Motif scaffolding. Structure first.
Motif, PDB file in Angstrom:
ATOM      1  N   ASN A   7      10.217  21.689  55.263  1.00 33.51           N
ATOM      2  CA  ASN A   7       8.980  21.570  56.020  1.00 33.51           C
ATOM      3  C   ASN A   7       8.574  20.099  56.106  1.00 33.51           C
ATOM      4  OD1 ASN A   7       6.575  22.253  57.411  1.00 33.51           O
ATOM      5  ND2 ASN A   7       6.326  24.122  56.199  1.00 33.51           N
ATOM      6  N   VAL A  10       3.006  19.483  57.023  1.00 38.64           N
ATOM      7  CA  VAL A  10       2.269  20.511  56.303  1.00 38.64           C
ATOM      8  C   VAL A  10       2.737  20.524  54.854  1.00 38.64           C
ATOM      9  CG1 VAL A  10       1.365  22.849  56.582  1.00 38.64           C
ATOM     10  CG2 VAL A  10       2.726  21.823  58.418  1.00 38.64           C
ATOM     11  N   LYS A  11       1.798  20.700  53.921  1.00 39.11           N
ATOM     12  CA  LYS A  11       2.114  20.705  52.490  1.00 39.11           C
ATOM     13  C   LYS A  11       2.675  19.342  52.077  1.00 39.11           C
ATOM     14  CE  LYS A  11       4.477  24.369  51.030  1.00 39.11           C
ATOM     15  NZ  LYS A  11       5.650  25.274  51.222  1.00 39.11           N
ATOM     16  N   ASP A  14      -1.537  16.680  53.263  1.00 42.33           N
ATOM     17  CA  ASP A  14      -2.683  17.352  52.643  1.00 42.33           C
ATOM     18  C   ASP A  14      -2.715  17.122  51.135  1.00 42.33           C
ATOM     19  OD1 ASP A  14      -4.749  19.582  53.786  1.00 42.33           O
ATOM     20  OD2 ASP A  14      -4.317  20.014  51.685  1.00 42.33           O
ATOM     21  N   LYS A  18      -5.934  16.203  48.589  1.00 40.48           N
ATOM     22  CA  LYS A  18      -6.349  17.174  47.579  1.00 40.48           C
ATOM     23  C   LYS A  18      -6.270  16.615  46.156  1.00 40.48           C
ATOM     24  CE  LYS A  18      -7.258  21.033  49.940  1.00 40.48           C
ATOM     25  NZ  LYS A  18      -6.873  20.729  51.348  1.00 40.48           N
ATOM     26  N   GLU A  19      -5.154  15.961  45.839  1.00 39.72           N
ATOM     27  CA  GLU A  19      -4.937  15.380  44.514  1.00 39.72           C
ATOM     28  C   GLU A  19      -6.030  14.375  44.146  1.00 39.72           C
ATOM     29  OE1 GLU A  19      -2.936  17.357  42.798  1.00 39.72           O
ATOM     30  OE2 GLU A  19      -1.576  15.782  42.133  1.00 39.72           O
ATOM     31  N   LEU A  22      -9.987  16.662  43.980  1.00 37.65           N
ATOM     32  CA  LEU A  22     -10.320  17.423  42.773  1.00 37.65           C
ATOM     33  C   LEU A  22      -9.992  16.654  41.498  1.00 37.65           C
ATOM     34  CD1 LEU A  22     -11.534  20.215  42.027  1.00 37.65           C
ATOM     35  CD2 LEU A  22     -11.094  19.910  44.471  1.00 37.65           C
ATOM     36  N   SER A  23      -8.732  16.288  41.347  1.00 34.29           N
ATOM     37  CA  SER A  23      -8.291  15.559  40.173  1.00 34.29           C
ATOM     38  C   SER A  23      -8.886  14.159  40.137  1.00 34.29           C
ATOM     39  CB  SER A  23      -6.765  15.514  40.115  1.00 34.29           C
ATOM     40  OG  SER A  23      -6.217  16.780  40.456  1.00 34.29           O
ATOM     41  N   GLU A  28      -1.207   9.718  40.048  1.00 32.91           N
ATOM     42  CA  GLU A  28      -0.757  10.992  40.580  1.00 32.91           C
ATOM     43  C   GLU A  28      -0.409  10.832  42.061  1.00 32.91           C
ATOM     44  OE1 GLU A  28      -3.762  14.002  39.254  1.00 32.91           O
ATOM     45  OE2 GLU A  28      -2.167  14.514  37.845  1.00 32.91           O
TER      46      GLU A  28
ATOM     47  N   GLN B 104       1.877  18.821  36.711  1.00 31.67           N
ATOM     48  CA  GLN B 104       1.563  18.836  38.139  1.00 31.67           C
ATOM     49  C   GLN B 104       2.285  19.984  38.836  1.00 31.67           C
ATOM     50  OE1 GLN B 104       2.575  14.811  38.326  1.00 31.67           O
ATOM     51  NE2 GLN B 104       0.497  14.265  37.702  1.00 31.67           N
ATOM     52  N   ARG B 112       0.710  29.609  43.364  1.00 36.84           N
ATOM     53  CA  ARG B 112       1.580  30.479  44.148  1.00 36.84           C
ATOM     54  C   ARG B 112       1.490  31.922  43.669  1.00 36.84           C
ATOM     55  NH1 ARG B 112       5.052  27.166  47.099  1.00 36.84           N
ATOM     56  NH2 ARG B 112       5.802  28.280  48.964  1.00 36.84           N
ATOM     57  N   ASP B 141      -6.276  22.694  37.086  1.00 35.91           N
ATOM     58  CA  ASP B 141      -6.965  21.949  38.139  1.00 35.91           C
ATOM     59  C   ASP B 141      -6.165  22.031  39.428  1.00 35.91           C
ATOM     60  OD1 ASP B 141      -9.263  19.938  38.681  1.00 35.91           O
ATOM     61  OD2 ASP B 141      -7.518  18.829  39.416  1.00 35.91           O
ATOM     62  N   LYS B 142      -4.914  21.568  39.367  1.00 40.60           N
ATOM     63  CA  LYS B 142      -4.006  21.607  40.515  1.00 40.60           C
ATOM     64  C   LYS B 142      -3.896  22.992  41.149  1.00 40.60           C
ATOM     65  CE  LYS B 142      -2.905  17.346  39.116  1.00 40.60           C
ATOM     66  NZ  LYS B 142      -3.457  16.506  40.211  1.00 40.60           N
ATOM     67  N   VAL B 145      -6.551  23.065  43.536  1.00 38.49           N
ATOM     68  CA  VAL B 145      -6.198  21.937  44.397  1.00 38.49           C
ATOM     69  C   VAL B 145      -5.167  22.371  45.446  1.00 38.49           C
ATOM     70  CG1 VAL B 145      -5.064  19.666  44.450  1.00 38.49           C
ATOM     71  CG2 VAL B 145      -6.653  20.220  42.603  1.00 38.49           C
ATOM     72  N   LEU B 146      -4.085  22.988  44.992  1.00 38.13           N
ATOM     73  CA  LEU B 146      -3.037  23.458  45.879  1.00 38.13           C
ATOM     74  C   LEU B 146      -3.395  24.768  46.598  1.00 38.13           C
ATOM     75  CD1 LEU B 146      -0.129  22.573  43.432  1.00 38.13           C
ATOM     76  CD2 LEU B 146      -0.966  21.167  45.328  1.00 38.13           C
ATOM     77  N   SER B 148      -6.192  25.666  47.747  1.00 34.05           N
ATOM     78  CA  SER B 148      -7.058  25.314  48.859  1.00 34.05           C
ATOM     79  C   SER B 148      -6.256  24.781  50.056  1.00 34.05           C
ATOM     80  CB  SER B 148      -8.078  24.267  48.387  1.00 34.05           C
ATOM     81  OG  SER B 148      -9.098  24.061  49.346  1.00 34.05           O
ATOM     82  N   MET B 149      -5.012  24.389  49.800  1.00 34.41           N
ATOM     83  CA  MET B 149      -4.153  23.814  50.828  1.00 34.41           C
ATOM     84  C   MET B 149      -3.463  24.857  51.715  1.00 34.41           C
ATOM     85  SD  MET B 149      -1.036  21.125  50.167  1.00 34.41           S
ATOM     86  CE  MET B 149      -2.150  20.417  48.954  1.00 34.41           C
ATOM     87  N   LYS B 156       2.664  30.061  58.112  1.00 32.04           N
ATOM     88  CA  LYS B 156       3.345  29.033  58.897  1.00 32.04           C
ATOM     89  C   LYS B 156       4.345  28.254  58.057  1.00 32.04           C
ATOM     90  CE  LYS B 156       1.863  29.731  63.000  1.00 32.04           C
ATOM     91  NZ  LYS B 156       2.770  30.511  63.881  1.00 32.04           N
ATOM     92  N   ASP B 157       4.582  28.723  56.845  1.00 32.90           N
ATOM     93  CA  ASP B 157       5.510  28.055  55.939  1.00 32.90           C
ATOM     94  C   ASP B 157       6.953  28.411  56.283  1.00 32.90           C
ATOM     95  OD1 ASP B 157       5.950  26.249  53.888  1.00 32.90           O
ATOM     96  OD2 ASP B 157       5.517  27.662  52.265  1.00 32.90           O
TER      97      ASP B 157
END
Lengths: 131, 163
Positions: A7, A10-11, A14, A18-19, A22-23, A28, B104, B112, B141-142, B145-146, B148-149, B156-157
């Protein structure tokens, strides 16, 4: 016969936001930007990070956002060319985001003002800013 | 529960998981699992599969969640997965030393699991400050964080076909 193609976009972009949100850690994000092989593509985050502060309410953003780019510039992660195009796209989005009567002029000026003072971009970019 | 003969189990699962990451055979693992027949030690499998994937490339990690989803319902109860995460979190402090990116990644595994539905959502809430480990906390935390992504881009993945 095989696995699905990797991909992109996307991913990817973002994650960077995000990192930091929140963090809130430099290293990082550092290792993550370093993960990408394309340095020329480093302009995307540059632009995005600038957009965030304009769409986010709170000093928390402006305090941590500028610190993000400056931190990257500490070890020469972002290129002037990349940072240039990042800001140029912003000057274009300004009228679209504001849509008549740009009250965000205060944020726009101060942000660029600080950047110039930081010594990361020359006067040429500041001249493109609606001063 | 306390796992009996920990190392003997790790050494035995070494090739089993290794052979899995080659072509991704979720059926192979289950078939072999029933052969071994484990109770509380059953949570060990999903844990190790996770630990090894930390050393390997990221591509091998995304494939780990596939194993979890496949295992759950077939040879692993939804409730068993939860215990596996706890067991993993406790191990985190050790692996985090060699691989600084370990925690991380751990966050992704949690995110997931919840996103697909193999782990309870309130799992993070249950650990909402009730953790004295910063290494384990970052993983939690992550997770959000993830989460929300890909919460919006969940369908669409997988839309690229060239293999």
């Amino acid at each position: 016969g095989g696995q699905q193609p990797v991909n992109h976009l996307v991913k990817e972009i973002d994650m960077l936001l995000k990192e930091y949100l929140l963090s809130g850690d430099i290293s990082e994000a550092e290792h993550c930007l370093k993960e990408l092989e394309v340095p020329h593509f480093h302009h995307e985050l540059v632009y995005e990070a600038i957009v965030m502060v304009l769409e986010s309410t709170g000093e928390s953003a402006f305090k941590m956002i500028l610190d993000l780019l400056k931190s990257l510039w500490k070890s020469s992660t972002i290129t002037i060319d990349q940072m240039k195009r990042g800001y140029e796209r912003i000057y274009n989005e300004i009228p679209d985001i504001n849509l008549d009567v740009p009250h965000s002029y205060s944020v726009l000026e101060r942000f660029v003002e600080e950047c110039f003072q930081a010594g990361i971009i020359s006067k040429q970019l500041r001249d493109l800013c609606p001063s | 529960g306390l796992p009996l003969d920990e190392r003997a189990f790790e050494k035995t699962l070494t090739p089993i998981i290794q052979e899995y990451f080659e072509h991704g055979d979720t059926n192979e693992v289950a078939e072999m699992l029933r052969d071994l027949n484990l109770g509380e030690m059953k949570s060990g499998v999903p844990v190790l599969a996770v630990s090894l994937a930390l050393e390997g490339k990221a591509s091998h990690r995304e494939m780990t969640s596939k194993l979890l989803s496949d295992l759950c319902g077939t040879v692993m109860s939804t409730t068993d997965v939860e215990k596996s995460f706890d067991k993993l979190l406790k191990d985190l402090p050790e692996l985090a030393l060699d691989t600084p990116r370990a925690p991380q990644l751990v966050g992704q595994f949690i995110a997931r699991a919840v996103g697909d539905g193999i782990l309870c959502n309130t799992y993070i809430d249950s650990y909402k400050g009730t953790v004295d480990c910063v290494q384990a906390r970052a993983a939690l935390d992550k997770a959000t964080v993830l989460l929300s992504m890909s919460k919006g881009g969940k369908r669409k993945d997988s839309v690229w076909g060239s293999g």
